[PDB]
DNA sequence: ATTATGACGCT
DNA sequence: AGCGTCAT
């Protein structure tokens with residue numbers, strides 16, 4: 001009852017760029033705007049691999065993780081922009097730099113957690129308290145929420161999507177008690193007003209559109225964000241959770257899309273998030289462990305406590321290349337040449353990072369895959385990173401991996417390497 | 431031959 | 442530390 005926490009203490013948003021690498025390429029090349037188009041890396045094998053797809057192209061069934069030759073079968077007029085290649089490998093610098101543009105704008109409104117190259121969580125609790133005082137018990141006009149959906153509404157006693165959006169928004173606003181400054185529903189609504197302003201700023205200042213979710217925690221904000229993509233934002237209230245979760249496949253919730261989520265389904269014989277409410281906390285802990293069980297018990301009631309971490313910058317800087325099929329590295333000189341290529345890109349990115357962000361990486365992680373294994377990594381080894389020098393780093397990497405060579409002859413490499421990976425970690429202020 | 435990343439958990 | 446899981 002009165003002592004039952006409801007997880008309504010925070011306002012959290014998740015902002016996610018729409019079709020992000022495609023938008024980056026469309027800004028650069030106006031010929032690609034408002035077209036079925038996709039971003040592809042490499043080209044020789046099956047036309048290259050698609051890694052981002054415009055919404056126009058998605059209408060034809062084009063997806064990421066699709067080969068371009070196959071995408072062209074669904075969409076003959078599909079336009080393609082290629083990822084830059086430098087030192088023999090895909091180079092994602094243009095997209096990392098575009099990401100920084102967006103992250104810096106978001107950071108003006110609140111402290112953010114960089115969750116991926118194109119999305120960030122925002123803890124808006126304090127900003128909402130501030131705006132609430134400015135409002136002075138003035139109602140929130142629908143005009144302040146021009147791209148906002150209220151999940152679950154409209155209900156009860158219609159043809160158009162925009163019309164339905166407004167219907168729901170009006171029901172929501174009509175029901176708001178604005179004179180309670182601690183009403184969670186009101187707090188979320190003010191949060192949504194701020195996120196409209198944030199999203200407007202991102203589009204004005206970069207040209208990029210995005211979607212967003214507003215709720216009381218990260219998992220609900222993430223889920224909310226996806227409900228109305230692209231170029232829209234969605235408010236998921238605490239009250240909307242029972243209906244939302246009653247038909248929500250467990251795999252849709254962040255962290256449950258893999259083996260754990262499959263085990264929840266199998267072990268408990270359920271399909272939807274809402275069905276979890278019928279188990280005790282101890283029951284869930286018994287199957288999924290203490291931490292997961294407690295997390296699931298709260299999460300299925302819309303409650304989660306994971307904080308928005310104040311972290312705008314990536315904690316690691318890495319460089320990776322696959323050498324599939326027949327291109328696998330079977331000679332020592334091959335291995336050394338590619339380690340150098342990776343190390344040269346790494347040095348470039350590290351030197352820029354040190355200048356921009358006043359920090360230095362202190363640990364180099366070297367990872368390889370050997371033909372045969374279908375684990376992503378076959379072996380991971382760390383060594384000290386004491387200087388930002390590509391030849392030193394590539395020589396050090398070679399030293400820590402050279403023992404994996406089963407070949408009795410040392411010019412040859414067996415089994416051939418199907419992946420190399422260099423990663424700089426353990427930053428210290430500088 | 432679903433590539434190139436990046437964070438966090440376990441032991 | 443090195444490995445695994447999950448994610449974009």
Ligand SMILES: Nc1ncnc2c1ncn2[C@H]1C[C@H](O)[C@@H](COP(=O)(O)OP(=O)(O)OP(=O)(O)O)O1
Pocket residue numbers: 016017018019020021022051052053117118229230433434449
């Ligand atoms: N598996 C991947 N491999 C390589 N790059 C990826 C992968 N997934 C995502 N990316 C890149 C390309 C995407 O434009 C970008 C952001 O990912 P993501 O948010 O999942 O999709 P998206 O921004 O392209 O479309 P959406 O509008 O659905 O968010 O990160």
Ligand SMILES: [Ca+2]
Pocket residue numbers: 016017018019020118
């Ligand atoms: Ca996105």
Ligand SMILES: [Mg+2]
Pocket residue numbers: 016017116118119449
């Ligand atoms: Mg994303």
